[PDB]
Amino acid sequence: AFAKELFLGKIKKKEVFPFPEVSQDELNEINQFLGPVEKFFTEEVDSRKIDQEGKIPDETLEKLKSLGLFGLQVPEEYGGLGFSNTMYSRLGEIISMDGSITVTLAAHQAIGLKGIILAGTEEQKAKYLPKLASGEHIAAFCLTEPASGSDAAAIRSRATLSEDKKHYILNGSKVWITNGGLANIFTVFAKTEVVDSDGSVKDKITAFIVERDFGGVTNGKPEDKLGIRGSNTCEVHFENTKIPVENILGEVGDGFKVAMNILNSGRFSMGSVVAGLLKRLIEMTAEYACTRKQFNKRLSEFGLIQEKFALMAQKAYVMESMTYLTAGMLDQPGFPDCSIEAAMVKVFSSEAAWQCVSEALQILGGLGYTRDYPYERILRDTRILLIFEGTNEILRMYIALTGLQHAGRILTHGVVHPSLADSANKFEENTYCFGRTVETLLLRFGKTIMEEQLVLKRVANILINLYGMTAVLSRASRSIRIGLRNHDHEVLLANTFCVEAYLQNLFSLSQLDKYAPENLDEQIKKVSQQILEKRAYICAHPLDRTC
Amino acid sequence: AFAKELFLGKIKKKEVFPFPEVSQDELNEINQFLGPVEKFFTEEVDSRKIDQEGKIPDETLEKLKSLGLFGLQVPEEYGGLGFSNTMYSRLGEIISMDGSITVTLAAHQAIGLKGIILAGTEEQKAKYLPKLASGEHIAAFCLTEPASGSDAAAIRSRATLSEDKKHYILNGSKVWITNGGLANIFTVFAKTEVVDSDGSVKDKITAFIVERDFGGVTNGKPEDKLGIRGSNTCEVHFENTKIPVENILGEVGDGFKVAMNILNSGRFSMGSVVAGLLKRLIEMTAEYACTRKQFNKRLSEFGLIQEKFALMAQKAYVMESMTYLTAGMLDQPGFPDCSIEAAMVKVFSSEAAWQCVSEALQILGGLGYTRDYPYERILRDTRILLIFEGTNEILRMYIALTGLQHAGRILTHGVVHPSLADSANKFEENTYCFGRTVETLLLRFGKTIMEEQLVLKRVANILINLYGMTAVLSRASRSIRIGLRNHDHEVLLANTFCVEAYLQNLFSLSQLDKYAPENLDEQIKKVSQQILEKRAYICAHPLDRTC
Ligand SMILES: Cc1cc2nc3c(=O)[nH]c(=O)nc-3n(C[C@H](O)[C@H](O)[C@H](O)COP(=O)(O)OP(=O)(O)OC[C@H]3O[C@@H](n4cnc5c(N)ncnc54)[C@H](O)[C@@H]3O)c2cc1C
Ligand SMILES: Cc1cc2nc3c(=O)[nH]c(=O)nc-3n(C[C@H](O)[C@H](O)[C@H](O)COP(=O)(O)OP(=O)(O)OC[C@H]3O[C@@H](n4cnc5c(N)ncnc54)[C@H](O)[C@@H]3O)c2cc1C
């Protein structure tokens, strides 16, 4: 991957900078495909009715099955469409208009049946995948226990062999699974004892493809969510579940690798989702500011709405750069390992989504707060993307933790257009200084870097900014060389983000020094310790007096 | 006030560093009153049922009337409680828990009947205030029309003087008037022709105390609000309203000044309302931060949760400093024009509220997004504070130019405790250079500063941070000298805020120079104007290519 090489202080030239280019025929045929898709979301989708009622209408879901979006990444031989990673991102740019169905389909494709394709047996593939991609079967990714979440190694669901050793018995419950109410196939992750030459009785996690027809799998009442009322998040209890031995992934005991790959192979497309959302915002607020008058003038002439529009456009553009570069590096021959960059795209998309949606509702003022306008649904559904597919704080570790281990093992520019000359120099300076800082950080902490949960956050921020800046440089250089329309606008959108990210990175890199007077790590530690040991607020009220 | 002297480069040390101190008898009286108030709010209020149903129950509102809480800033002779400013903030900290009720009370007290006390006559006061503060009459502040929330100098409500000289006739419609559904007294603001010696027929803004019993005033259907569903925000229509000639504030032709003075006196309370929220959150999450297991450890042992808790505590402490210093400035003899400070505290409180509520729901992760937990209600209700009593976006103009206009006319440190030495050494610096910058602006921009609103926003940020830093310095110095419990915790919070605000203000001041390459005023302007002319996102997809 490109991210893993950032820590060593080297930038892989002749790579990333040539932006992924798609030939004409795929683009033409996918416009022919998106015709009906865009039409169907525009006419037949009643977003307000779905959000208010909280139940997806049967006709809409049936038509969605008919268009076959359930198998976008499924290979053609198994009834899928075989769209590449880039094409999935392009279709996800427009799939996000509803807001509720996007989560259901991300659960069905990105994570749900991803396990069968990644590590399932060929017989299991032929048995299940053609029916899953057709839409009759829906996959739900059951991983979390009521007292679980991150660090799923500690699951309390027991699966054990039977006397005849011909079928497994499973008993457990799962709490937060998207589309668990209607799903007919679950990728349950449970625990089972394993025996080896040492005679050990260690317990290891294993996967299980479980149907609702096996019996003993029961569903509870759907949980009344805040924003995406369309999704059907439920409770599943497995009591006395009988599983034939053929329903297992890889080999018994290797559940951690499958779980990690499933989580790490489906977070880049989300980055495009937000981008599409932001487009809709600038398709609805821009107009309003034109039909509303203040200071005897239209709203658009004020500089303080102009800066908000520029910020929204900058976030959308940088987000598109991230998503499409990441989806273009996954289409190379083989199986490249670019799980970090999907995390970068996910984190940046969530942050920019929250900031820009808050600002957009602010521009509409008091009018946007009511439900007559649809800005409620956008704000409520934008929140979940920070929670969805793992929290941002975990991915802040994953970007730093996994990359630094690769960095630790090793220790133990005429490509951009002349118009963007300053951005290349700033990117080179940031990469060099950041490499030196990471080298010093690994030298000083050594192996104790795990507990420095604050340092990893700053390193993750710097890495996300560097990846954003380099993706934007690559996209702008392509747009200039091809001579695409409005190339000066995209040059300005590149330079603004380059200056902003350079300032932020220079701030973050400065406070990662041994003798930095601005290093505010101990103060936060002490204060947080005080509140956490008291478990309430500390400071007494100003009114009270004690001589 | 203290803020107006900041731009000249001089610190009003006598006014703000000796922190306001309440006498023992007054403190005993206020605790005696909060006793029953805290009991009633804790045991009787059913926040979830009010939020879900959207209608305030009759019994709880009647009990609130029995407590006589609708009037507390009312003078004691007019049935009021005669509470001072600091007592209002302290009782706001308590009433902040419900969320729906605080909006109704702010509409009744801070804005609604504030006009009668500020500019009403003795006869009008004796006629209306005793019934208003009793609870059987509620005042609603009608200022906005379908197309006029800001710049009220452009209202289209027509009030004309009848030929008999004894009645005014009023016709108009108002939108987004808090508690307009049940209010029986309106401070309607309209326009009426005025005749002078010059023979002009110009229209001037006038106020009108209007009763529902007059006739021709109709209530529309309540707006279906997003979060604060308890408060009844409705539509009020004035069709042929007859107004007796004695219901005018001040004199005919001074409605704009009365409106401005009403608005500029009720924005410090919600500086501490958020405190009465955030402290509760720092408790409500803290329990959850110790009753869940991850990585085999309590979440409180992680760095990120520690950082979030310290941030929440810091914001709560700074808002306490701002609100109580501002409430102590007002209680001095006379009524100094502290219009800047109230707006400043409001905007800082709103920003910190949004940030901290986002972080707090993030800590609870997937459980917080559920409607069962009360974190959903807090997130939905915290939105209004970026809108209510006018948006915080325009309140960044009063803070920006009300001092510059004051500074324009003029141009045409042993009090702090030694422990907080270096922080004070920063504060003076963060003022001194700042003053120079301001005066340089008054040269370079001449009188054109109004239109270049980005500079105004930057100056607003610098001033807000300076006031926050000086307020926390003064409060921490008082707490050290008196010897309150956990004073070292207060010192740590004060030092953290001083360093953070100094960094942010140095960044803001560094980019206000002409020869600073950190300036983005021109590029943002160009990008925003391009987008606004295009009416939508102008940049195209990267998949599309041109031969
Ligand atoms: C729950 C609620 C409570 C309310 N309470 C009150 C109340 O107590 N009193 C009251 O008077 N109104 C109140 N309002 C009305 C509110 O202030 C809005 O003005 C109203 O909803 C309609 O105004 P608008 O959308 O036309 O505002 P606009 O000003 O048209 O909104 C456009 C946005 O552009 C920006 N902007 C506007 N003018 C300027 C400028 N000159 N310079 C720079 N930026 C600018 C601001 O961000 C503004 O929000 C309330 C509204 C709601 C929803
Ligand atoms: C809509 C939705 C969709 C979901 N989809 C899935 C899914 O596809 N797959 C799945 O497995 N689960 C999924 N979940 C479950 C979710 O990931 C968690 O299991 C759930 O929030 C349970 O609470 P928690 O363990 O995250 O508690 P939390 O306290 O929220 O745990 C995560 C948070 O705790 C802190 N934290 C945790 N670990 C660390 C650490 N090592 N270092 C620092 N801080 C840390 C951080 O603040 C982090 O944000 C979903 C949940 C929801 C609501």
Q: From CA A234, how far away is CA A181, in angstroms rounded?
A: 5
Q: From CA B133, how far away is CA A74, in angstroms rounded?
A: 69
CATH code: domain A413-531 is 1.20.140.10
* Cα within 13 Å of Cα(A329), Cβ side: 25
- For residue A298, which ligand has an atom nearest its CA? 1
DSSP string, B249-260: SSSTT-HHHHHH
Q: Which chain A residues contact residue B295 at CB under 8 A?
A: 150-151
Q: Assess whether the C-beta atom of B452 lies below 6 angstroms from ligand 1.
A: no
CB atoms within 10 A of CB B430: 21
3-state secondary structure of B504: helix
Residue in the block written with tokens 């045409």: B412
Q: From CA A424, how far away is CA A470, in angstroms rounded?
A: 9
Q: Which chain B residues contact residue A361 at CB under 8 A?
A: 383
Task: Locate A388 and state its tokens.
Answer: 């969805």
Distances (CA, A) of B111 to B94, B260, B262, B390, B469: 19, 11, 6, 12, 29
CB atoms within 10 A of CB A161: 15
Q: From CA B465, how far away is CA A463, in angstroms rounded?
A: 29
Contact B210, B247 (CB under 8 A): yes
Q: From CA B159, how far away is CA B230, in angstroms rounded?
A: 32
- For residue B457, which ligand has an atom nearest its CA? 1
CA-based angle A355:A357:A363, to the nearest 5?
105
Closest CA to A309 of A370, A241, A359: A359
Q: Are strands B139-140 and B185-193 parallel, antiparallel or unpaired?
A: parallel
Task: Say yes or no for a CB contact (<8 Å) between B151 and A295.
Answer: yes
Ligand 2 atom with least separation from CA of B294: 38
Task: Locate B435 and state its tokens.
Answer: 């003053």
Q: From CA B293, how far away is CA B300, in angstroms rounded?
A: 10
Closest CA to B234 of B107, B148, B137: B107
Fold for domain A262-394? Butyryl-CoA Dehydrogenase, subunit A; domain 3 (1.20.140)
Q: From CA A479, how far away is CA A477, in angstroms rounded?
A: 5
Q: Which residue in B147, B176, B286 is closest to A293 by CB distance?
A: B147
End-to-end CA distance of chain B: 65
Distances (CA, A) of A6 to A54, A400, B255: 45, 11, 63
Give B265: exposed, middle or buried? Use CB within 10 Å, 0-12, 13-18, 19+. Answer: buried
Residue B527 is which amino acid? Answer: V
Q: Which residues does a chain break follow in chain A (C to N more than 2.5 Å)?
A: 412
Contact B511, B458 (CB under 8 A): yes
Q: Assess whether the C-beta atom of B149 lies below 6 angstroms from ligand 1.
A: yes
Specify the CATH class of B139-252 in words: mainly beta
Provide the shortest C-alpha distance from residue A273 to chain B (in Å).
Answer: 14
Radius of gyration of the CA atoms of chain B, in A: 25
Listed in sequence order, the residues at least 6 apart from B232 whose beta carbon sits closer than 8 Å to its beta carbon are: B55, B56, B179, B180, B181, B182, B222
Provide the shortest C-alpha distance from residue B126 to chain A (in Å).
Answer: 33
Ramachandran class of A236: left when φ > 0, alpha when ψ lies in -120 to 50, beta otherwise: beta
**Nearest-10 crossing angle of helices A392-411, A421-445:** 80
Q: Where are the alpha helices (DSSP H) in B382-452?
A: 395-411, 421-444
Q: How far is the CA of B151 from the centre of ligand 1 (A)?
A: 9
DSSP string, A121-187: -HHHHHHHHHHHHHTSS-EE-----TT-SSSTT----EEEE-SSSSEEEEEEEEEEETTTTT-SEEE
CA-based angle A486:A487:A493, to the nearest 5?
100
Provide the shortest C-alpha distance from residue B269 to chain A (in Å).
Answer: 15
Give A448: exposed, middle or buried? Use CB within 10 Å, 0-12, 13-18, 19+. Answer: exposed
Catalytic residue among A389, A428, A439, A500: A389
- What number of residues does chain B have? 547
Closest CA to B263 of B381, B75, B374, B402: B402
Ramachandran class of B196: left when φ > 0, alpha when ψ lies in -120 to 50, beta otherwise: beta
Q: Which chain B residues contact residue A496 at CB under 8 A?
A: 520, 523-524, 527
Q: Assess whether the C-beta atom of B520 lies below 6 angstroms from ligand 1.
A: no
DSSP B370: B
Task: Locate B540 and state its tokens.
Answer: 């195209």
3-state secondary structure of A95: helix
Nearest CA in chain B to A222: B370
Torsion angles phi and psi, residue B169, rounded to 5: -110, 130
Q: From CA A61, how far away is CA A15, in angstroms rounded?
A: 41
Contact A329, A2 (CB under 8 A): yes
Per-residue burial over B199-228, b if 16 or more Cβ lie within 10 Å, else e, is: eeeebebbbbbbbbebeebeeeebbebbbb
Contact A111, A189 (CB under 8 A): no
Question: What's the CATH number of domain A24-136, 1.10.150.120, 3.40.47.10, 3.60.110.10, 1.10.540.10?
Answer: 1.10.540.10
Residue A497 is which amino acid? Answer: F
3-state secondary structure of A464: helix
Radius of gyration of the CA atoms of chain A, in A: 25
Listed in sequence order, the residues at least 6 apart from B79 whose beta carbon sits closer than 8 Å to its beta carbon are: B68, B71, B129, B130, B131, B133, B134
Q: Assess whether the C-beta atom of B33 lies below 6 angstroms from ligand 1.
A: no
Q: From CA A244, how far away is CA B126, in angstroms rounded?
A: 86
- Per CATH, B18-134 and B396-531 having the same topology is answered no
CA-based angle A231:B541:A284, to the nearest 5?
60
Provide the shortest C-alpha distance from residue A286 to chain B (in Å).
Answer: 6
Catalytic residues of B: 389
Sign of CA dihedral B443, B444, B449, B453: negative
Listed in sequence order, the residues at least 6 apart from B511 whose beta carbon sits closer than 8 Å to its beta carbon are: B458, B518, B519, B520
Fold for domain A140-252? Butyryl-CoA Dehydrogenase, subunit A; domain 2 (2.40.110)
Q: Assess whether the C-beta atom of A363 lies below 6 angstroms from ligand 1.
A: yes
Q: Is A510 on the interface with B (CB under 8 A)?
A: no
Determine the distance from the C-alpha atom of residue A421 to the mean position of all C-alpha atoms in its chain, rounded to a whole number. Answer: 32
Torsion angles phi and psi, residue B172, rounded to 5: 180, 175
Residue A231 is which amino acid? Answer: S
Contact A330, A338 (CB under 8 A): yes
Task: Say yes or no for a CB contact (<8 Å) between B306 and A535.
Answer: no
Give A107: exposed, middle or buried? Use CB within 10 Å, 0-12, 13-18, 19+. Answer: buried
Q: From CA A516, how far away is CA A500, in angstroms rounded?
A: 22
DSSP B178: T
Homologous superfamily (CATH) of B18-134 is Acyl-CoA dehydrogenase/oxidase, N-terminal domain (1.10.540.10)
Residue in the block written with tokens 């007059």: B214
Closest CA to A499 of B457, B527, B453: B527
Q: From CA B1, how far away is CA B22, in angstroms rounded?
A: 21
The domains of chain A are located at 24-136, 140-252, 262-394, 413-531
Closest CA to A488 of A435, A428, A422, A419: A419
Strand ranges in B109-233 using DSSP code E only, listed in sequence order: 139-140, 158-161, 167-177, 185-193, 203-211, 217-219
Q: Where are the alpha helices (DSSP H) in B393-539?
A: 395-411, 421-444, 453-482, 487-510, 521-534
Homologous superfamily (CATH) of B263-388 is Butyryl-CoA Dehydrogenase, subunit A, domain 3 (1.20.140.10)
Q: From CA A139, how far away is CA A128, in angstroms rounded?
A: 10
Q: From CA A463, how far away is CA B186, in angstroms rounded?
A: 57
Task: Locate A512 and state its tokens.
Answer: 């990662």
Q: How far is the CA of A360 from the centre of ligand 2 (A)?
A: 28
Distances (CA, A) of B282 to A386, A535, B141, B306: 21, 8, 35, 11
3-state secondary structure of B240: strand
Q: From CA B528, how far away is CA A286, in angstroms rounded?
A: 10
CATH code: domain B396-531 is 1.20.140.10
SS3 content of chain B, % helix, strand, coil (to 5): 55, 10, 35
Residue in the block written with tokens 């307000």: A48
Q: From CA B262, how far away is CA B442, in angstroms rounded?
A: 30
Q: From CA B379, how far away is CA B377, in angstroms rounded?
A: 6
CB atoms within 10 A of CB A47: 18
Ligand 2 atom with least separation from CA of B308: 47
Sign of CA dihedral A387, A393, A394, A398: positive
Per-residue burial over A501-520, b if 16 or more Cβ lie within 10 Å, else e, is: bbbebeebbeebeeeeeeeb
Distances (CA, A) of B470 to B19, B22, B425, B437, B466: 11, 20, 11, 19, 6
Residue in the block written with tokens 């239209």: A298
Torsion angles phi and psi, residue A203, rounded to 5: -105, 130
Active site residue A389: yes
Q: How far is the CA of A7 from the centre of ligand 2 (A)?
A: 28
* Cα within 13 Å of Cα(A67), Cβ side: 20
Residue in the block written with tokens 């009114």: A543
Resolution in A: 3.6
Q: Are strands B297-298 and B293-294 parallel, antiparallel or unpaired?
A: antiparallel
Determine the distance from the C-alpha atom of residue A370 to the mean position of all C-alpha atoms in its chain, rounded to a whole number. Answer: 29
Q: From CA A75, how far away is CA A84, in angstroms rounded?
A: 10
Q: Which chain A residues contact residue B323 at CB under 8 A?
A: none
CA-based angle A44:A48:A52, to the nearest 5?
125
Ligand 2 atom with least separation from CA of A231: 1
3-state secondary structure of A67: helix
- Report the structure determination method: cryo-EM
Q: How far is the CA of B149 from the centre of ligand 1 (A)?
A: 5
Strand ranges in B116-165 using DSSP code E only, listed in sequence order: 139-140, 158-161
3-state secondary structure of B377: helix
